[PDB]
Amino acid sequence: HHSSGMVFYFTSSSVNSSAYTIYMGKDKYENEDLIKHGWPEDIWFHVDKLSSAHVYLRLHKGENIEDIPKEVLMDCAHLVKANSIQGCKMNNVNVVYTPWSNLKKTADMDVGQIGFHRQKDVKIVTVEKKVNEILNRLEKTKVERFPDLAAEKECRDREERNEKKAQIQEMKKREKEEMKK
Amino acid sequence: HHHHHHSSGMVFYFTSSSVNSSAYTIYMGKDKYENEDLIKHGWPEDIWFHVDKLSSAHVYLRLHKGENIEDIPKEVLMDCAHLVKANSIQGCKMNNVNVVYTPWSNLKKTADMDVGQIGFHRQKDVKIVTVEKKVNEILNRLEKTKVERFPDLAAEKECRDREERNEKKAQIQEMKKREKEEMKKKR
DNA sequence: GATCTACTAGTGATCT
DNA sequence: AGATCACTAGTAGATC
């Protein structure tokens, strides 16, 4: 039950010239909170049928899992590779990714074990060989942080609530003028 | 597509890259009221930008934790200055205009100051840079990263304060650990 | 107030 | 150096 509040955080830019934040739990325990308090916009990554840390990638607002730039999607799976017991030396390794929302906490939760509400929403992409330059490019953007996971999620939800409120009020405002017209 | 008009709480956010591949967040309040909260809830790591002796919005730049105003990459600092210029009513066309920048922490608001008016605790910590002419190729790049969001500024600052306190706790814990290991060393 | 029970937790030690 | 693990050591309800 080690607090070990430390979470690794990275930054990966795209050839689309969009910057994306990718985060990893230092701890197999810490991961549990990442799971407890992860966001709708997060995409979960792990090696299939092997043990690895749990790299996550956070999409920009309103983005969808398929929209991941391929260069960016590549950065996540390489990371999950080097931070796998067997991956760091294995070639042709298989990484699974799914949205945080498709993750379901098993009753035999253990540590480092998750399920998926719908296996169809599980996607797979394969890593062929160790690629040191992705890793070293990432390490320069690595930083250690001690977040209040629960707090940050609420913030996002709040921003969202206000964003919907503005959308919905402008929507109901329009029917007001149309009823008169 | 961010297809939204105007509603109180709207804050623009942009993104600018570094040659070392560190990404920086730039955020701006175009609005006189909006500006005021950005001023209340700004961060220690924020750098404030404005056109000199001219009316302009309040562009802010957020450094990574523990980064310092002098180490600001020139590429990014220029993107801030080009923004506050283009979001200046006369600046958007003026050549050889002066932008002042200072950390948010150096910002001071006296009882004389009304809404959208700010001062500087220390004039020494105020810096200046002049931009010569519009360089739309920058602005086109920055607009591609524009996003509108209605944050709970008070909340987000607190989140950051919390991480910091957590980082202090952790440091203190490892000290207590090492101090413990030393007592054992000869007992 | 006195055991009593059940829970964190700080300490030692032995696996990988 | 690190983590699981293993007794002791201590705190919290709670309980009669």
Curated annotation (Swiss-Prot), chain B:
Residues passing through the membrane, by range: 76-92
Entry-linked InterPro entries: Jlp2/Ccd25, NFACT_RNA-bd
Main location: membrane
Cytoplasmic membrane side: 93-187
Region described as DNA-binding: 30-34
Family per similarity comment: Belongs to the CCDC25 family.
Coiled-coil region list: 126-187
Organism: Homo sapiens
UniProt biased composition (Basic and acidic residues): 157-187
This protein's record includes keyword Transmembrane: yes
Membrane topology summary: Single-pass membrane protein
Cellular component terms (Gene Ontology): endomembrane system; plasma membrane
Name this polypeptide is given: Coiled-coil domain-containing protein 25
GO MF assignments: DNA binding
One Pfam family hit: NFACT-R_1
Complex formation: Interacts (via cytoplasmic region) with ILK.
Location(s), subcellular: Cell membrane; Endomembrane system
Topological domains, Extracellular: 10-75
Keywords: Acetylation, Cell membrane, Coiled coil, DNA-binding, Membrane, Phosphoprotein, Transmembrane, Transmembrane helix
GO-annotated biological processes: positive regulation of cell motility
Sequence positions bearing N6-acetyllysine: K32
Function noted in UniProt: Transmembrane receptor that senses neutrophil extracellular traps (NETs) and triggers the ILK-PARVB pathway to enhance cell motility. NETs are mainly composed of DNA fibers and are released by neutrophils to bind pathogens during inflammation. Formation of NETs is also associated with cancer metastasis, NET-DNA acting as a chemotactic factor to attract cancer cells.
Gene: CCDC25
